Every structure is written in C-alpha cells, then in structure tokens.
Amino acid sequence: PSPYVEFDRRQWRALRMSTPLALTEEELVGLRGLGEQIDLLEVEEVYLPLARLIHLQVAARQRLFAATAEFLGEPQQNPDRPVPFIIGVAGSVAVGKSTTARVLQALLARWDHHPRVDLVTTDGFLYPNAELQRRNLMHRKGFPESYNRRALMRFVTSVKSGSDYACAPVYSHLHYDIIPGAEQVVRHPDILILEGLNVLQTGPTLMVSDLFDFSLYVDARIEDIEQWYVSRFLAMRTTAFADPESHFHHYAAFSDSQAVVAAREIWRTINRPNLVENILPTRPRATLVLRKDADHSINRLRLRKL
Amino acid sequence: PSPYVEFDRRQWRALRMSTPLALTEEELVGLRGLGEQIDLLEVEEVYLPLARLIHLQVAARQRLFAATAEFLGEPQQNPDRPVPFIIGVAGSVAVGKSTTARVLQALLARWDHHPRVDLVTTDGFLYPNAELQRRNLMHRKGFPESYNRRALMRFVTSVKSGSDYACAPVYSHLHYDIIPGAEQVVRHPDILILEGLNVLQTGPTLMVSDLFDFSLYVDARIEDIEQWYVSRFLAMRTTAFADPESHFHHYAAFSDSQAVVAAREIWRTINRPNLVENILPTRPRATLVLRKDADHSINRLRLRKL
Ligand SMILES: C[C@H](NC(=O)c1ccccc1C(F)(F)F)c1nnc(SCCOc2ccc(F)cc2)n1Cc1ccc(F)cc1
Numbered sequence A, B: 001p002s003p004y005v006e007f008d009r010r011q012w013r014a015l016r017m018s019t020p021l022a023l024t025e026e027e028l029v030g031l032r033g034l035g036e037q038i039d040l041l042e043v044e045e046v047y048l049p050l051a052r053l054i055h056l057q058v059a060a061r062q063r064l065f066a067a068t069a070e071f072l073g074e075p076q077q078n079p080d081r082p083v084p085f086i087i088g089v090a091g092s093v094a095v096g097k098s099t100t101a102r103v104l105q106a107l108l109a110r111w112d113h114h115p116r117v118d119l120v121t122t123d124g125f126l127y128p129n130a131e132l133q134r135r136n137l138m139h140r141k142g143f144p145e146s147y148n149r150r151a152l153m154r155f156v157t158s159v160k161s162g163s164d165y166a167c168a169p170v171y172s173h174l175h176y177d178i179i180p181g182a183e184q185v186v187r188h189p190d191i192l193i194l195e196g197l198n199v200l201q202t203g204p205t206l207m208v209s210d211l212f213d214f215s216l217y218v219d220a221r222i223e224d225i226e227q228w229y230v231s232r233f234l235a236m237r238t239t240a241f242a243d244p245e246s247h248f249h250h251y252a253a254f255s256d257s258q259a260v261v262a263a264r265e266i267w268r269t270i271n272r273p274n275l276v277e278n279i280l281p282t283r284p285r286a287t288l289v290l291r292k293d294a295d296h297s298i299n300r301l302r303l304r305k306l
C-alpha cells in the first residue's frame, strides 16, 4: 500500500473521463506552434486529461477562497480574489520540463475559471557568470548553490502575496548568461507555472516549494535521458551553436563522432551527477510523477492520493 | 505585502462572522473533561472559529476527492473515500502545543463530515534511552536526531496511504522513556493531528511536512515561554516528580528557589537552544501562526492567503 495512485499508458489513455475530451483544429494549430517536434496525439490523449485533473484543483482552491472569505465576513485585510495558484515542474536537464510546461500553460488557459496563465523558468535566477566566477561556481551551473536562492524566494513570495507586480530576471541559453537589464513581469496571473531543475529542492529554512499548490516531476530511465541530451546537443550544432554570438561557437561543428563523445562527457561530469545527487531525490516530493519511455511517450503516472 | 492575512484579538473575536458560532452546554461540559483549567471563553471565541476555518479546508478536500474520483471514472486502484486529512502542530516546549492540539481534536469532531479525529505526538518516535545511549545522544533529546525519523516517515506515509492500520510507539514523560511493547493504533481517521517539536522540520529527501494538508505553529515571545517552562517545572514537583516511579523523582525535593535555578538552567541550556536553532526557523512554513500573550491568551493570527 502506497500514497500514490498509479496508471499505465492504457488506463490513462482510456478516456472514460466522459467529456468527449478532444481539441479543436484552431487549438491543434496553436500547439504545433511550440515545435519541439511536438506530438499532438500525446497532447490530446495525455496532457489534456492532465490539464483537467489540475483544473479540478484550481477550481476547488477558488471556491475554498470564496467560502473562507465569506466566513471571515470579508474584512479589508483579506484580498479580493484568490492569489495565483502555483504549479512546480521539475526534472533532469533534457527530460522535457520546458515542453511539458509550455503545453500545460496552453491547455490550462482554455478554462474561463483561469485564463491568465504565466510561466517562469528558474534559469532566470542563476547568478550571472561574473558572479559565478567570483564564487568559483562556474563548473557548477544548475547545482543548488548556483542560484540566487534569496531572489527566487523573494520572487515567489511576492507572487503568493498577491502583488500586482513581481519581476524575474532573464537567462539567455544562447549566451550562457543572464541578460543584463532584462526582466519578465508577472501581474497576478490565475496560474503561474514554475519550471526548473531545483524547484522541488529542500532547504534549511523556508523553500520555494512551500508555496506550490501542485507539483509535477518529469521522469525517465537515466539512460534514456542521456540519449535525449546527446541528440539535442548534436542538433544544437546548427540552430544555436552555429550563431556567431553563441558562447559555445568553439564547438559549432567538430565531427558528429566527436560531438557525441563530448556530450557524453558533459553529461557524465555535470548533468548526470546533478540528477543523481540533487534532482532525483526530489521526485517523491511531487504531487504527480510522469514517467516517459525511450521515445518520450508516457508509460506511467503516479498521482498522490486525495 | 506578505503571504499572510493578519488578525489581532478583537478582529478574531468579532464573530458577527457569517455564522453564529456558540458551543452548547453538553459541549462545554465535555470540554472541561480535559480542563487543565482550560479557558472555555477562548475555546468558544478563538478555537471554535479556528476549527471552522479548518473544517472548510477539510470539506473542500472531500469534494475535490469526489470530483476527481468521478473524472477518473473511479478505477479499482483509486481508494473509495478520502485518505486522512493531516494537520501538523508545532512550536516550543511548554508553548501549549498539546492543549492546542487537544482542543482542535474535540472541536473538529463536532462536524458529521469528519467525526473520527485522531491525535499522535511525535514523542513516541524518540529513540528509547538505551538506543540514545549507544548513539551518544541523551543530551540531545528533543533535537532532530533523537527521533527515529525513518519510522516517523513510515508511519505518516502509511496513514496518507489510506491503510486500515498504522502503529506508533508510546513515550512516557514520567519514566522519561519509551514504554516497551506499548502501541497507539490509528485506523483511517478522517483527520489526524500530529503534534511535535519537529513536525515542520526540513530534511534532504521527503520529510513529514510533505504529507500535511494544514499546519499550525504555536508562538510567543521567548521570555514568556521561559516563564511558562519554569512555572510548569515547579508545579510538577507535586504532580509527576512526586511519583516515586518518576525518572525525575529527586526534583520533588526542591525548594522554590532551587527549582527556579535548575529549571532556568535546563531551559537556557537545552530547550531554549533547540527553539532558536531547530524550532523557530520552521515558523514560516506553517499555514497558520498563533501568537499568545504572556497570559496564554492569543493576540495575533497570521494565516496564509488562499
Ligand atoms: C553544465 C551546463 N549546464 C547548463 O547549461 C544548464 C544550466 C542550468 C539549466 C539548464 C542548463 C542546460 F539545459 F542548458 F543544460 C551544461 N550542460 N550542457 C552544456 S552544453 C551547452 C548547452 O547544450 C545543451 C545540450 C543538450 C540539451 F538537452 C540542453 C542543452 N552545458 C554548458 C557547459 C558545457 C561544457 C562545460 F564544460 C560546462 C558547461
């Protein structure tokens, strides 16, 4: 006996969920438009039921806000609407956190209950390269201490406060650095998705996940993520690495075989250990774990018992 | 702005609040049953409203479980009813956690949504004195490592799993040790309250506060808790210390003056440092912070915005 309800591919797919849960052609066009060669069959058979389950929790939290406001005879110091409902998205580099997150942002905005949905990545809260250097942490980008934890906690707290205005900094992956002067403004959305390696990480004191209303961990066999990491790396030889401004131009194209080999070594030396030491242990902390098989198709969902 | 809604005493009192909330006389009689000279005016004027607020969260969770079971077309692997709703209660030694906990236990069982409310203290998860010897930890009794944290995690996990049967050990304060062979059995309650110094403490992997649905922190100025710790040590001269089976039986023989000196020492040397290091840093992780005046009456509630 476990604290999770477990579903295989078959039962999950088996949309007994008696909304004829099917997207329209307008929407499917829109969803192509996040093109990580996105498989619209998974969006409709898997991510749509998931947006639905999460929808039930957001709507529940919204009536609990109403009932509670009514009970407290709605006094001045109580807010006028619910604060943003915050979803955390965690997993290894290259498992597809960002794609999952973008898809949920899109699906969840479909309901009139919560149409304004924001997405922030914790990437924006890494220390600038210059600062990482000052601390001797360059070889540790994406490990817990390479993030300005205070700023990230201030950011999320302010969002949970129901501020009209919360600012995050912006990270360019192209430049391998924080963009000086850039800011993403978040203005009391109904939902805010927060995606990052570290979102479910444990801290001595108050931590970001203490402000999450729901959380998701994207999982896969460690070997399978290695393969996805390697492939994205070779593929980047065009798209990004090719660009002159790319911090990683000194790789831009140096033999497929030698790119495989370097990718494997960056994986084994940085990203894989960050996974074992720091990310995987946060897995049992998620409300929902999604396990994908070799070709990114979901084969197992574990959902915390309500 | 902050993540908290704040009430002072008068505001909380003002139960012109959308429902009449008064206790009946059979209720007030029952509530005297634990009447360590319980202030029954506070019980009806502060704790009743507090239990109502919590009830709203319990009932929300019950509906969400049903809306969710129906969306999932109710599978064999989803449980038939909600699993226990778990409330944590934390704060210093002598701050009145146990009283607080016992007053919400009886009050919450008032509603037919959730009549079966249990109470467990984490004291039952301290290592027995003998195992605490092997480890050189007798001087750290009540510090995070004096607990069998693995068994405490297993116990709370098993309850959140909806199992019919979960056993906690039993601590005797009289004998200053775990009673060998004795067990408290928990059998799928609607609500389980978990009271302890350590309930909201952080750790690297999964931690018990992950499995909570609501949590309370009982608060006061450190001066005042010292005053209550001291008063209770003196008072115990007559009561528990007087028992000849009392592990602290030699404390019965203490003059007032000697008792003040000794109590003041145990405090400023063991309990006060535990408060400052391990217990007080957990205060912002609570859903609700109850602050008490020197006289034991509540004077601030801080509640997390919904
Ligand atoms: C460790 C570093 N981490 C990140 O850049 C990073 C840091 C924080 C969040 C995400 C990421 C990212 F997804 F991009 F991997 C990394 N992990 N992979 C690389 S290569 C440049 C980015 O390339 C890829 C390749 C595949 C991929 F799936 C995502 C990004 N780096 C930069 C780097 C290369 C060599 C070296 F010796 C030190 C660093």
Ligand SMILES: C[C@H](NC(=O)c1ccccc1C(F)(F)F)c1nnc(SCCOc2ccc(F)cc2)n1Cc1ccc(F)cc1
Residues within 6 Å of the ligand: B093, B094, B123, B141, B142, B173, B197, B228, B229, B230, B232, B233, B236, B248, B266, B270, B271
């Ligand atoms: C630090 C210790 N803590 C625990 O026993 C303990 C451990 C876990 C939870 C609760 C408690 C308790 F509240 F009872 F204090 C303690 N704190 N107070 C004492 S004296 C016996 C219990 O007396 C009181 C006195 C006041 C009070 F509010 C609660 C308990 N001890 C045992 C002890 C005495 C002398 C010495 F040198 C070392 C230890």
